[PDB]
């Protein structure tokens, strides 16, 4: 069973019929301008080929998908012992997939200023995605940063309990820019493929991250990667995936494929409605479930 | 490999001194922290085993997985997940499990218990399985927090059962006892998506086996499921009697009992063993 | 306090009955009349004035928590009571259901009937009426339906705050809450509190002063379930309510008041009863 | 109330100082002397008696009563209790907890921060009968630098659309309110205005409405001593409000205003020396309203 492009196109057309029932994120003004009728998917396989369908030219922000990359970069630089003293393993320290825990992970990114810390993250993202031209959306970063009262509430909370000791406005500058990193579904799928090959570049078999770090990321993508519905996603789809409210889903099917999906129309629970239907269809038809 | 497994058990037994048996249920405080048994059941319908394999141990929370399977079979996915949640009230925590137990069909405790035993007997391929009366009684005599939870569920209209009848069933359900060999065969049915490894009969639908294995990854290991996924990486379910039921999809059922628990309520000795086995045979599903 | 002025106040407050509703969650309580309202005011010269439906006997419900706390404070002492429950608006205070259950479990005696008799003896002395007993029908209705209270009891047992048979505790607790009397008897209890524990007829001490003060403090910080702050602003006196529609009030050095008005507001206190007390407080300047 | 007795009550209460500890989480308050204790008692004949260390102290949480009364006058009761709770236990529970207190301070009227502060200061000067009252710049600054929890509350309140102000601007006003400082004599004078239902003891004119004075005293019984208001009611029995600088403001209805400062706090963050002194005084003069 290889992934037939024409087959992908058909799944995309079916899933797009759900766009009417979803709604784009509108609490961040710049995301409210997204098209709920867009849907794109890429699947990257270990032969280092990719198949894709739908609106694949559209660059979309990672949003909470970036929490998985920042976790992986922190784990590399600091090691598992230190990271898991600051954040938790459980869906006691804060989970790194929830906003409060992600901010602690972001405050741990190495570098002497916002731009150097961001550059360390962008360089890492560019390597995983096999695309040196990846950057962030300045409009979306600015729209997040003007409007982010609850993330500021959590930064101050974290400061008060002495979990972090950074300047909140500088931590928020880094975090909103991390969330505003943008790419196509093709780039996102390749990041998933690296995770699926336990950290190895699919082109050069270079370890982009340690096997232990790839594994750690995948565990969190099963136990708590889909917002407040990971348990339902495990039952109905059954692959490691991380979602964000711009409509992205990054998935890593161990040893098999990276998948990247962008469908801006979200369900009532903040996950891509069009994207999850597409992945439900794909998982069933290709027997992707790890369970 | 049979001889290797004996060696792994010996190695994992060294950790017994660092754990302690559950003592909050008096019958369970009588367990020997030095015992450890394991069986591994493969799809060829063969089993290998090591350690204290004749010792029958109670399921405790492992029984929560079986009861969920049974109620999913009898009521369907739709009605079940209108009563309990899918998210790590969840059917693996005591409050959700008591709801699942209250859904078991039958006109009396006896009939409802027999439905669950008949189902366990089929999964285990052993018609001789029953429960420990001593353990059931020790549980029933002092289960204040579970009785608190039953009244909580009544108060809020989540169940309308008599609390004493529900507690009779629940304690008996938790007291179902078997050896590590029977427990691995149950893991094997799950690993094979509901299929009987001898006859290929579906003992449960594929969707039900999948659903069970998902809870076993997200919240099967008490309060340390995320750490177990990192350190071992297989669908497993534990209980405070020291059992760990694991189902490695398409590969083997594993049954461990090691009464010496860690500070987080999971078999310390049996953990260490599954960490060795998982490394040695590349069991992680991640 | 003029009788006929009291009658006019009661008829004004009865206009509110339509906006309230009786408690039906204890089934026998749903049988009460939302239109009834009775008040008695008892004064230090040992006289009482009343108005409205003064012959109806009504259960204390949560008002009985104050009586039980007084008894237990006398019998066990302050130090032991506040080692087991707190003093703040281990149970927070003796007014919330979890602390009340702990207080009730501290009543001494070998039997439920003996523990209860000690409660009734005390209430009969407070009220100056020896015929006070409990409503068997209301006690049963509560006992058959009291799921949350049993949940609390098993939680208290788990954490070794109580070690009593839960059915025995709940038999005692439901009977305590089902103790019934007229507004006149209730007002007399209020006056005993207002006079710092002294009997108004014979002037001898039915409870120590320190015990009367303690009850009156909980009657300000947490005596109207969910609305003690609002009540302090709109009425301004120590009072305790229950879901049968009772309000017991004790205006320090001035009067005791008992009101029964079964039509409750959304917060579970007598709607007709609080409106009546708001008018009374304004007229007689009762606020502490 | 005789003066020499007061002096002996102060000497008695001071022996507890060794069992208390000054608030050192606002570093500036860490500099206070745990052996200080002062008390003033103001009576409706407009006379005052005092003992111990008459010396200026920041009001801290005591200012929340003063802010509540100012906003109640300015916006009315049914805007105020639209926004904040009235109850001991996203709308904040009451105006005495930090979150409700920030909503209160956000409702103070004025264009500038300094305009808002000037209205509050003018009000406090009227109440205390002392136009020399200002705030401690050192304490305001030490607060403003380390106030992480209150900023976290401000952002949560903004997210849920309870407040609108810029957080730094609200924080500037709030920390300066909390840094208003005065002696126990000024404080007792405030407590007497409350006790006389809002009347000035000298002139007899209303400084605040009776309804506002009564609302203030109710929160001072139900939740004025932070986490020990029920204990305080049993052991002392009067409307009081405390703050972490060691202050206690009390108003005994119809009878006296009391102001205490004792920087050595018990483990609930109320003045340890202050509360012992007030227990002795309540017993001696039968002050309890219960």
Swiss-Prot record, chain C:
Homotetramer. It holds the Pfam family Glutaminase. It comes from the Bacteria. Substrate binds at residues 62, 97, 142, 149, 173, 225, 243. Keywords: Hydrolase. One of its GO terms (biological process) is glutamate biosynthetic process. Coiled coil: none annotated. GO terms for molecular function: glutaminase activity. It comes from Geobacillus kaustophilus (strain HTA426). This is Glutaminase. The keyword Hydrolase applies. Its EC number is 3.5.1.2. The gene is glsA. PANTHER family: GLUTAMINASE.
């Amino acid at each position: 069973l290889v992934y037939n492009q024409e087959e992908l196109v058909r799944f995309v057309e079916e899933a797009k019929q759900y766009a009417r029932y979803g709604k784009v994120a509108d609490y961040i003004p710049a995301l409210g301008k997204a098209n709920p009728n867009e849907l794109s998917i890429a699947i990257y396989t270990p032969d280092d080929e990719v198949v894709s369908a739908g609106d694949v030219t559209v660059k979309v922000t990672l949003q909470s998908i970036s929490k998985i990359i920042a976790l992986a970069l922190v784990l590399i630089d600091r090691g598992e012992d230190e990271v898991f003293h600051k954040v938790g393993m459980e869906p006691k320290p804060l989970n790194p997939m929830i906003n409060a825990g992600a901010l602690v992970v972001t405050s741990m990114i190495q570098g002497g200023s916002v731009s150097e810390r961001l550059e360390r993250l962008l360089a890492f993202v560019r390597r995983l995605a096999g695309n040196e031209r990846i950057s962030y959306s300045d409009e979306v970063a600015r729209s997040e940063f003007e409007t982010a009262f609850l993330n500021r509430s959590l930064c101050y909370f974290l400061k008060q309990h002495r979990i972090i000791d950074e300047d909140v406005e500088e931590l928020m500058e880094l975090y909103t820019k991390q969330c505003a990193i943008e790419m196509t579904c093709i780039d996102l799928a390749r990041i998933g493929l690296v995770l699926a090959l336990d950290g190895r570049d699919p082109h050069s078999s270079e370890p982009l991250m340690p096997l232990d770090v790839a594994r750690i990321c995948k565990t969190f993508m099963v136990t708590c990667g889909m917002y407040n519905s990971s348990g339902e996603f495990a039952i109905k789809v059954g692959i490691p995936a991380k979602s964000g409210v711009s409509g992205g889903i990054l998935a890593a099917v161990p040893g098999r494929c990276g998948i990247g999906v962008f469908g801006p129309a979200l369900d009532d629970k903040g996950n891509s409605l069009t994207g999850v239907k597409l992945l439900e269809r794909l998982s069933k038809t290709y027997s992707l479930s790890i369970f």
